[PDB]
Amino acid sequence: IFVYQNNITPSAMKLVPSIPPATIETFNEAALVVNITHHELVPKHIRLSSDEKRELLKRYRLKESQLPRIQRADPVALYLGLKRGEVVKIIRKSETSGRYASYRICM
Amino acid sequence: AGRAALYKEVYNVIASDGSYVNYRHMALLVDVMTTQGGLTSVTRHGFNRSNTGALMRCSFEETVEILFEAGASAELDDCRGVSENVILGQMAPIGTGAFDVMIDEESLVKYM
Amino acid sequence: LRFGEMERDCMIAHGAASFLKERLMEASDAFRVHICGICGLMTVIAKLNHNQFECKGCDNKIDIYQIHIPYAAKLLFQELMAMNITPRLYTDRSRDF
Amino acid sequence: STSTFQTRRRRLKKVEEEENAATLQLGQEFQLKQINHQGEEEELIALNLSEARLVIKEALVERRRAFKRSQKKTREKELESIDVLLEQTTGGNNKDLKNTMQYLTNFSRFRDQETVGAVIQLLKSTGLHPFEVAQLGSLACDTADEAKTLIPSLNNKISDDELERILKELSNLETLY
Amino acid sequence: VGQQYSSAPLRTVKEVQFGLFSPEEVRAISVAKIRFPETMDETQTRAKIGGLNDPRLGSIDRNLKCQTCQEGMNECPGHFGHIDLAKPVFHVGFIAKIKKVCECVCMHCGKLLLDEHNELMRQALAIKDSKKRFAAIWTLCKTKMVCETDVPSEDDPTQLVSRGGCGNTQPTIRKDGLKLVGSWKKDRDEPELRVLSTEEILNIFKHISVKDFTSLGFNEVFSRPEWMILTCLPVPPPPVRPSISFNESQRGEDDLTFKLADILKANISLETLEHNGAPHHAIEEAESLLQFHVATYMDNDIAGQPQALQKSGRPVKSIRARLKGKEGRIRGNLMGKRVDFSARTVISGDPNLELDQVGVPKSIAKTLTYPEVVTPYNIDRLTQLVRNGPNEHPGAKYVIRDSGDRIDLRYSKRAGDIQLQYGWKVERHIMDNDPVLFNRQPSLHKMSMMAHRVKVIPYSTFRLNLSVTSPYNADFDGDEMNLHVPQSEETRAELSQLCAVPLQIVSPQSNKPCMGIVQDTLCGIRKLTLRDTFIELDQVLNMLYWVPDWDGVI
Amino acid sequence: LKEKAIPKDQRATTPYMTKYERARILGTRALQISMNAPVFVDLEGETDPLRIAMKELAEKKIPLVIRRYLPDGSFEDWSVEELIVDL
Amino acid sequence: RLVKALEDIMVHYDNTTRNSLGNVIQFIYGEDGMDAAHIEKQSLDTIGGSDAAFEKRYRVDLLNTDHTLDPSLLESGSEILGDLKLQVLLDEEYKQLVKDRKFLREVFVDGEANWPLPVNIRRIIQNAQQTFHIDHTKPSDLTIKDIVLGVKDLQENLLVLRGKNEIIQNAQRDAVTLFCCLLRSRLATRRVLQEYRLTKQAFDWVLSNIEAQFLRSVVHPGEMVGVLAAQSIGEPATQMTLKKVTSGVPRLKEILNVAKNMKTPSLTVY
Amino acid sequence: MFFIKDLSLNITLHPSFFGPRMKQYLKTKLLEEVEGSCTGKFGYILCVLDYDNIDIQRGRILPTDGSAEFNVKYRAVVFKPFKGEVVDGTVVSCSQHGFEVQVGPMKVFVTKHLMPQDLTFNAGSNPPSYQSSEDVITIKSRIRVKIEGCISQVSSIHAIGSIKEDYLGAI
DNA sequence: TTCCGGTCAT
RNA sequence: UCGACCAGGA
Ligand SMILES: [Mg+2]
Ligand SMILES: [Zn+2]
Ligand SMILES: [Zn+2]
Ligand SMILES: [Zn+2]
């Protein structure tokens, strides 16, 4: 995790995906001043083991596509750092039934 | 959280009037608009571009334009869309038709 | 009279499945055409007498179905073909799901 | 019509309908590898006359039976004995079956379900393909040439001596008249 | 539907495979050479020439013949014909792609412009979405204008690896009307502008690789890029472009039947130039005319103005136009149709009907019919209706027998006669308590259409109960309403079991009942309430008698 | 296809008959009854098919099987007999 | 538009909300699988009220002369005072109605306690009442075990989803939570005896009904919810006949279009 | 050569026959529309085996008329000649253009010029025949032919065969 | 937005 | 008899 101040040079960033398996992430200071997950509206998300996911699917008879999706650059998807394929479980409050379980895969 | 707002806003539009709509509806819509990825619009620009069949999207705002690129890209239509069948003249998989009916020859004997 | 779009949307909401079809087919268009089980088209030269059926080109005489669809639809199709676009009518799904 | 246990995905271009020859190349509907209703695989089913005469009779018979559970609620000698089994369990207008039993019963080569059994147990050690293992049973063959020539699909699949032995044991099992 | 039994099995459509016609197929299918542009008159002699419409295709004049296919008019759908063009033409609608494709592949050798070799490309080759590969691929190679022959592999940028060859510079391309033109940059300077002949484009495509097709949003079997260019033209049959006869000695030809006529003409003219005084490029002035018509025939609302107006200044109905949303085919013929067994008049309130009822005027109930099937259970009652005639009320007006034949109850020398047969149908009149779907447009509610009980009444109006007023959202200030009549024992069921007004009382759109009590009944129900309000015997008795379910207990 | 056929056990759908189902069964059965199909109940004098159906459907003497399809295509089979009919 | 954009959405037999692709759009219609039709504004008594008043109502202490059920209510009144094995269920209960309280105040921050919920319990009891001519005079005949242990046995049967596994049976609990809070809110020992003198008969009845009534309020796989929802919103849109914000109709238009440049942009910072 | 292939057929039953012994009727009809049929892809359908364990599966009710449609799966005995297949049958018809041998349910025809040469054709014979040095071919005479080719048609199958090779002719 | 006479003329 | 326009109804 690398925290830059005002910005990074377009010559540098093109050096992150050049050493797998390892992975790197770029975050701006001004964006981390406040934690978005703390916001009234943002419900808590949760990563899912490639075990817990292969489950969710089987239990609903779903194919990867039929699953609601979250953006690879989505604020929270970055907060947790998902990866194309990882599924997040979204649990929130509800004025119809206290809590509601939702799932979001990633693209 | 966007969904949360998108809904909150839509809810306000119907509330400003002194009317009432049961969550579920505005929710459902607010949801159809979100799932896909971010903010898909309820317009020929968005939703009517999804993976849905051709014949379906075909019946709204782009028709031929859409049909053309359908056979050009050799699309395949499931015929699971209400629309799909209405165009073919077949019973749509809808309530009454969300299932099949059969004569169980077996049970057809215990009855006598 | 006219069972326009909105009137449809209502029956769909109602779940009144068969009723909608009965409006759209039996009480309107409803037409019976023959197809090639091979190349999903209206090609089929049905002589419905000497039971001959053919369909030279995809050359058949054996695999032939018969379907009911709104005459308008038939037209929708023929019109599309004249625009050199091919809509295939297949009686069995092969893509699963 | 009457579909056949194998949905061959025909994608538009139906053009390759090979020939039908004793190159053991029978229509796609008769590969050595066909499918049984249970969903299993199974070798094609090759019937040599007189072996068929028995399968048919066998069902036409057991039909007349279950055709009465519900009813409540020597060569020239078998021609008459079969005509009846038809005018009882057949459509009568199945002029083919009539003519199939005559033929099937005239050119047949065995009368005992025991004799036909051995014929099979015998040829079924050849590893040959069903169609041959049929013609061999329904065609008289004195020489390996009469054989390997009226069933050219054999040619290199079995030594002439061997095939000659088999032919010996056939005329030896061939029931009299 | 259609009539006349067919030994052909019947199924429903399960999939719709969209594709493009291959000139070769178009030919095979066709049953008409279609060489002449004229319509009929074998020298004024009336009939049809082996030229256009019916050189073996469908018919007119109420005459069996449809290539012996007989059946005649109603039953014989069309039988496409074709017409061998002169020189390849674009497809008004595909031009967009055809262009976007060249920009993706270079001529001469015809192959992609970015192999697995370029990494940015890899990412664009994993995307499984015809619509998206081809939308990213294009974005990637629309820029590169040099058919690279040697590129730096997954190793050193020092070492250069080889693949396909022919660096022939790639020309950028722009769209002028119905043609494609591109400039080739020459260095040392100044451009090189030349027109890309269809004949040429078509070729480059024919040579595009098998895996190249697919990589770009295509399909080896149903849609090869090479098919976006028209070689052979399918000729929709009469039923697509019917005529209109004012008896005889006149005309009646359809718009389309003309554009073909033109396309045909403009075609022949061309041909007779390449086998005659061919001033080489005084032809491409008459080959643009073919590209034109064969374009306009399909699409006629383009950017390049020329509307292809038909003598009289009338626009010309292009095929596209026929499908274009609303008022047309897809949306106006398929998603919504006109229908039979329907009626509509003015509505008025009637405080004497139960909620779920609807007053239908004798007029109508004697007009609208319901097909009942003769059954021991009704034989009797049904035979009486038939007897009764189609003029008395409780009656019928059509008896149909197994032999698929209609007995017209108002003429048939046997009207009075007739013994029904278990199995026959007797289209009768609508009768008290025949479930019907009532409705008042605009319909934006489940409730804008509800099943009602039919109550045949005098006078000419659909008399609906008041409380079912607010759902339809109707007043009687001259408001009209539609009535539809079910047709299958099972259709009715779908109405009476899911649409019957009593059922609609509480609505999901706001988890609260959606019909109440209004005007008088409301205003009055308050007054009638007040402590101050008392009623004496004589009347309390009548009021009691009024509630039909009074237990008879004063 | 039988991998797409779910066992009577492992069954998971609603133990009760959906309003559409019954709506259709009744109709379907009514239609058949109107076609001169056999009636499995003593008609207490009834003579209307949908009326007969409603009766058949109350003594659960209707020989029909509702095959409920699932999003993925696999289905469950229920019998008017089984299905509870609240409403 | 609204319509065409949700035609294909219906509740499938699994109790999921999907479209023609099978793309789950809602895992449980409306996040509760209840058919809008069977719903009424009820009040979650457990929310509002002074922490003080909450006790005086739901608290039962069998180890206290002043905090026990007066034997004038229960039949086995005197023979309970002091029982320790019961004061465990009786405390289990209360620790729950309390967990409840905090839970709702975390969902409906507004304090608003009136919400739409299947099964109208108020009335279901109102009937229990005058159906058995219950006299607010003589004492009940409910075991404290009777009540508490039956209310617990009820929730087990309010099935929305059915599945034979954890992931599923786990949604079940979810899609019922709120309702139960209301349930426990109205079937708490103190209440059940002091407020509405129910007999064993009445209670066993009230339960049976809540179950059946509930089970009916579920949604029928088949309901074409999309079109429904569409209209339900698009309908009250026409009736829209017309503090300085963007407004109705045009605003809704603004929303469905997902327009970048909205007339009013505003933003409220607390 | 004769075969035992596993086929299936779809019958559409009118609600009328939704009786007690429906199964009975179905089967009954299966047979009406199979035994005696003919195809190019199955040839001659002769007899339905195992009449008793015929699988009917649950039939599904169509949806405009109560007619139900069951996929009756069965098994029976078929027979479809081939080109190059050798078979023997009894002659039936015999003209100046050759004779026609009857191999089972089918009729194979042999051309005058598809036989040998030493075999001419005698016209003034009763019944009509073909004479040789030591052989004589007429009506009842049994022959063994080699089917050169097959030609499917309607509800039958014809084929031309020769007796010009070796081990072919009379018996 | 949807649904539902007269005139002119091609 | 395919249409376009104008006027009008809830
Ligand atoms: Mg009005
Ligand atoms: Zn074909
Ligand atoms: Zn024809
Ligand atoms: Zn090149």
The residues near H124 (Cβ < 8 Å, ≥ 6 apart) are none
H37/F44 Cα distance (integer angstroms)? 47
* Domain span including residue H29: 1-82
* Distance in angstroms: CA E254, C1' J1: 12
Q: Which residues of chain F neighbour A62 with C-beta distances below 8 Å?
A: 71-72
Q: Determine the nucleotide nearest to E442 by Cα–C1' distance.
A: I2
Residue D24: what residue type? L
Task: Report the DSSP pairing between strands H59-61 and E111-112.
Answer: unpaired
Q: Cα of E257 to ligand 3 centre, how many Å?
A: 19
Residue E501 belongs to what H/E stretch? helix E501-504
Structure tokens at G76: 């086995």
Please report, as a single letter, which amino acid is at residue E409. L
* 3-state SS, one letter per residue, for E277-331: CCCHHHCCCCCHHHHHHHHHCCCCCCCCCCCCCECCCECCCCHHHHHCCCCCHHH
F6–chain B Cβ distance below 8 A for any pair? no
Contact D3/H7, CB-based, under 8 Å?
A: yes
d(CA F4, CA F74): 4
Contact H101, H91 (CB under 8 A): yes
For chain A, the farthest-separated pair of C-alpha atoms sits apart, in whole angstroms, at 51
Residue pair E40/E49 in contact by the 8 Å Cβ criterion: yes
Q: Which positions of chain J lie under 7 Å from any protein Cβ?
A: 1-2, 9-10
CA dist., res. A60 & res. G20, Å (int): 16
**Which H or E run contains H160?**
strand H156-162
Q: What is the largest CA-CA distance in chain G?
A: 73
Distance CA D23, CA H72 (A): 34
At residue E510, the 3 state secondary structure works out as helix
Instruction: List the domain range (segments joined by +) for residue F32.
Output: 1-87
Q: Are E402 and E410 in contact (CB under 8 A)?
A: no
The number of residues making up chain F comes to 87
User: What is the number of the ligand closest to the CA of E67?
Assistant: 3
Q: Among C75, D17, C39, which residue's Cα sits nearest to residue E222?
A: C39
Please tell me if residue G27 touches chain A, with a CB cutoff of 8 Å.
yes
Residue E398 near residue E426 (C-beta atoms within 8 A): yes
Range E520-528 contact pairs with CB under 8 angstroms and sequence separation of 24 or more: E520/E351, E521/E351, E521/E466, E521/E467
Q: Are G105 and G165 in contact (CB under 8 A)?
A: no
Q: Which two tokens stand for residue H32?
A: 């009406």
In a domain, C65, yes or no: yes
E317 CB contact with strand I at below 7 Å: no
CA neighbor of F19 nearest in space, from A10, D163, G223: G223
Half-sphere exposure of D39 (CA within 13 A, CB side): 3
Q: What are phi and psi of E111, to 5 degrees?
A: -165, 165
Closest CA to G99 of G188, G181, G186: G181
Protein CA E259 to sugar C1' I9 (Å): 21
C83 touches strand I (CB under 7 A): no
Q: Is E402 exposed, middle or buried (0-12, 13-18, 19+ CB in 10 A)?
A: exposed
Q: Choose among G233, G220, G219, G223: nearest CA to G3.
A: G233
Architecture label for domain D47-71+74-177: Up-down Bundle (1.20)
- Cβ(E19)–Cβ(B70) under 8 Å? no
Range of the domain at A55: 35-107
Give the residue from E4, B54, E72 showing the smallest Cα distance to C66.
E4
CA of E345 to C1' of J3 (A): 27
Amino acid letter for position E73: M
J1 C1': nearest CA residue: E244
Q: Which fold has domain E368-430?
A: Dna Ligase; domain 1 (3.30.1490)
Pick the residue from chain B with its C-alpha nearest to G220.
B95
User: Which residues fall inside 7 Å of strand J, measured at CB?
Assistant: E 244, 246, 441-442, 474-475, 477-480
Query: Which positions ≥6 away from H45 have C-beta within 8 Å?
Result: D2, H7, H34, H35, H36, H37, H38, H39, H76, H77, H78
Task: Please give the Cα distance from E449 to E468 (Å, whole number).
Answer: 11
* Beta pairing partners, E89: E230
Of E87, E66, E82, residue with least CA distance to E34: E82
Point out the residue nearest to J4 (C-alpha to C1'): E314
Q: Among E515, E466, E243, which residue's Cα sits nearest to residue E358? A: E466
Per DSSP, E170 falls in state P
Experimentally, how was this structure solved? X-ray
Q: Is the peptide bond before E442 cis (omega within 30 degrees of 0)?
A: yes
Structural domains in chain C (count): 1
Q: What is the CATH number of the domain that holds H46?
A: 3.30.1490.120
Task: State phi, psi for D22 to the nearest 5 degrees.
Answer: -80, 50
Q: Do chains C and G have 3 or more beta-carbon pairs under 8 angstroms? A: yes
- Return the H-helix or E-strand segment holding A2: strand A2-4
Tell me how crowded residue B73 is: count the other CB atoms within 10 A of its CB: 21
- From F20, F31, F47, residue closest to E489, measured CB to CB: F31
Residue C27: domain span:
1-85
Q: Cβ–Cβ contacts within 10 Å for residue B9, how many?
A: 16
The full DSSP string for E212-226 is: HHHHTT-BTTTB-GG
The SS3 call for residue E17 is strand
Q: Compute the distance between CA of residue E452 and CA of residue E484 in angstroms, rounded to an integer.
A: 11
For ligand 2, the distance from its centroid to the CA atom of residue E28, given in whole angstroms, is 9
Beta bridge partners of C68: C32
> Which amino acid would we find at residue D16?
E
CA–CA separation, A56 vs A54, rounded Å? Answer: 6
| CA D42/CA D35 separation, integer angstroms | 6
Cis ω for the linkage preceding G118 (within 30 of 0) = no
Domain total for chain H? 2
- Shortest CA distance from A61: residue in chain F: F72
Helix (H) or strand (E) holding H98: strand H98-102
- From first CA to last CA, the distance across chain A in angstroms is 21
DSSP-based three-state secondary structure for E190: coil
**The domain boundary residue, chosen from H45, H63, H82:** H82
Count CB neighbours of B12 within 10 A.
16
- Measured in angstroms, the CA of G20 and the nearest CA of chain A are apart by 10
Domain-located, residue C93? no
| A79: contact with B, CB 8 A cutoff | no
Measure F28 CA to nearest chain E CA, in Å.
Answer: 6
Q: List all nucleotides in chain I with at least one atom under 7 A from a protein Cβ.
A: 1-4, 10
DSSP letter at E10 equals: B
Question: How far is it between the farthest Cα atoms of chain H?
Answer: 72
Helix (H) or strand (E) holding C82: helix C71-82
Query: Which residues 6+ apart lie within 8 Å of E377 measured at CB?
Result: F47, F48, F49
CB of B33 within 8 Å of a chain E CB? The answer is: no
- How long, in residues, is chain G? 270
CA of E235 to the centre of ligand 3 (A): 15
Structural domain includes residue C32: yes
Q: Which of B25, B44, B42 is nearest to B33 (CA)?
A: B42
Task: Give the residue before each break in chain D, using a C-to-N cut-off of over 2.5 angstroms; say none if it is continuous.
Answer: 73
* 8 A C-beta contact, residue H12 and residue H67: yes
CB pair distance less than 8 Å for B76 and C87: no
Measured over the CA atoms of residue G168, residue G173, residue G177 and residue G182, the dihedral's sign is positive
Interface test with H, best of C62, C63, C65 (most H CBs within 10 A): C62
Give distance in angstroms: CA of E335 to centre of ligand 1.
Answer: 27
User: G209 and G25 in contact (C-beta within 8 Å)?
Assistant: no
Strand I and E326 CB separated by under 7 Å: yes
Task: Please list every residue in chain F whose beta carbon sits closer than 8 Å to the beta carbon of residue H61.
Answer: 28, 32, 64
Spacing of E311 CA from J4 C1' in Å: 16
Q: How far apart are CA E464 and CA E353, in angstroms?
A: 7
Residue E371 tokens, joined: 């097909």
Q: What angle do CA E168, E169, E173 make, to 5 degrees?
A: 125
CATH of the domain at C54: 3.90.1800.10
Both tokens of residue E502? 């009593």
Which amino acid, one-letter code, is at E328?
Answer: G
- C87, β-bridge pairs: E18
Burial E250-274 (b: 16+ CB within 10 A, else e): eeeebbbbbbbbbbbebbeebeebe
At residue E234, what are phi and psi to the nearest 5 degrees?
Answer: -70, 140
For every residue of H14-82, which 3-state class applies, written as one string?
CHHHCCCCHHHHHHHHHHHCCCCCECCCCEEEEEECCHHHCECCCEEECCCCCCEEEEEEEEEEEECCC
How far apart are the two ends of chain B, measured CA to CA in Å?
62
Residue whose C-alpha is closest to residue G226's, from G10, G30, G2: G10
Pairing of strands E342-349, E480-484: antiparallel
Domain E341-367+431-504 has CATH 3.40.50.2300: no
| Separation CA C40–CA C92 (nearest Å) | 11
Residue with tokens 């390759």: D16
H105: CATH: 2.40.50.140
Q: Does B104 touch chain H (CB under 8 A)?
A: yes
For G188, list phi and psi in degrees, rounded to 5: -95, 130
| Specified resolution (Å) | 3.8
Protein CA at E250 to nucleotide C1' at J7, angstroms: 34
Q: Within a 10 A sphere around the Cβ of D23, how many other Cβ atoms?
A: 12
Whether the Cβ atoms of residue E298 and residue C85 lie closer than 8 Å to each other: no
Per-residue CA distances from E516 to E468, G39, G241 (Å): 8, 18, 22
Give the Cα separation of B45 and B33 in Å (integer): 12
Which of E234, E297, E279, E265 is CA-nearest to residue E86?
A: E265
Q: Is the CB of E14 under 7 A from strand I?
A: no
Of H32, H52, H82, the residue that ends a domain is H82
Which of A39, A71, A95 has its CB closest to that of B1?
A39
> Is F28 part of the contact surface with chain B (CB cutoff 8 Å)?
yes
Strand pairing report for A26-28 and A2-4: parallel
Contact of chains E and C by CB distance (3 or more pairs under 8 angstroms):
yes
Q: Exposed/middle/buried for E478, CB within 10 Å: 0-12, 13-18, 19+? A: exposed
Instruction: Give backbone dihedrals phi and psi of E119, rounded to 5 degrees, phi first.
Output: -60, -45
Q: Verify if strand I has an atom below 7 Å from the CB of C47.
A: no
Closest by Cα among E428, E458, E466 to E362: E458
Distance, angstroms, CA E340 to C1' J7?
29
Give residue H26's identity as a one-letter amino acid code. Answer: L
Dihedral sign of CA atoms A53, A55, A59, A62 in order: positive
The alpha carbon of E77 and the centre of ligand 3 are apart by a number of angstroms equal to 6
Q: Are strands H2-13 and H68-79 parallel, antiparallel or unpaired?
A: antiparallel
Strands E342-349 and E462-464: parallel
Beta partners for C33?
C67
- Amino acid code (one letter) for H171: I
**Interatomic CA distance for residues E338 and G196, integer angstroms:** 60
Residue C37 lies in a domain: yes
Nearest CA to F62 among F46, F86, F78?
Answer: F78
Three-state DSSP class for B33? helix
Judge residue E227's burial from the number of C-beta atoms within 10 Å of its C-beta, 0-12 exposed, 13-18 middle, 19 or more buried: buried
Compute, in angstroms, the gap from residue C37 CA to the centroid of ligand 3: 19
User: What distance in Å separates the CA atoms of residue E11 and residue H60, rounded to the nearest whole number?
Assistant: 13
Q: Which residue is nearest to nucleotide J3 (CA to C1')?
A: E314
G5/B31 Cα distance (integer angstroms):
12
Going by C-alpha positions, the residue among F29, G204, E536, A82 that lies closest to residue H68 is: F29
Same domain, yes or no: H137 and H74: no
Residue H118: CB atoms within 10 A of its CB come to: 10
Domain shared by H167 and H92, yes or no: yes
HSE on the CB side for B60, CA within 13 Å?
Answer: 23
Search chain E and give the residue with CA nearest G3: E444
Verify whether the Cβ–Cβ distance B51 to G2 is below 8 Å: no
- SS (HEC) of E358-408: EEEEHHHHCCCEECCECCCCCHHHHHHHHHHCCCCCCCEEEEEECCCEEEC
Note whether B92 and G10 are within 8 A (CB). no
For residue D152, how many other CB atoms are within 10 A of its CB? 15
Tokens representing residue A101 in the block: 């379980």
Residue C16 CB neighbours (<10 A): 31
Nearest to D13 by CA among B18, C95, G15, E19: E19
Q: Are D153 and D23 in contact (CB under 8 A)?
A: yes
**Cβ contact, residue pair E9, D12, below 8 Å:** no
Overall size of chain D counted in residues: 177
CATH number, domain containing residue A100: 3.90.940.20
* Complete DSSP assignment for chain D: ---BS------S--------BTTTB--GGG-SEEE-TTS-EEE--EE-TTTHHHHHHHHHHHHHHHTTTTTT--THHHHHHHHHHHHHHS-S--HHHHHHHHHHHHS-----TTHHHHHHHHHTTS---TTHHHHHHHS--SSHHHHHHHSTTSTTSS-HHHHHHHHHHHHTTS---
CA-to-C1' distance for E342 and J7, Å? Answer: 27
Classify strands H68-79 and H59-61 as parallel, antiparallel or unpaired. antiparallel
What is the CATH number for F37? Answer: 3.90.940.10
The two tokens of residue E330 are: 């897809």
Which amino acid is located at G124 in the chain? I
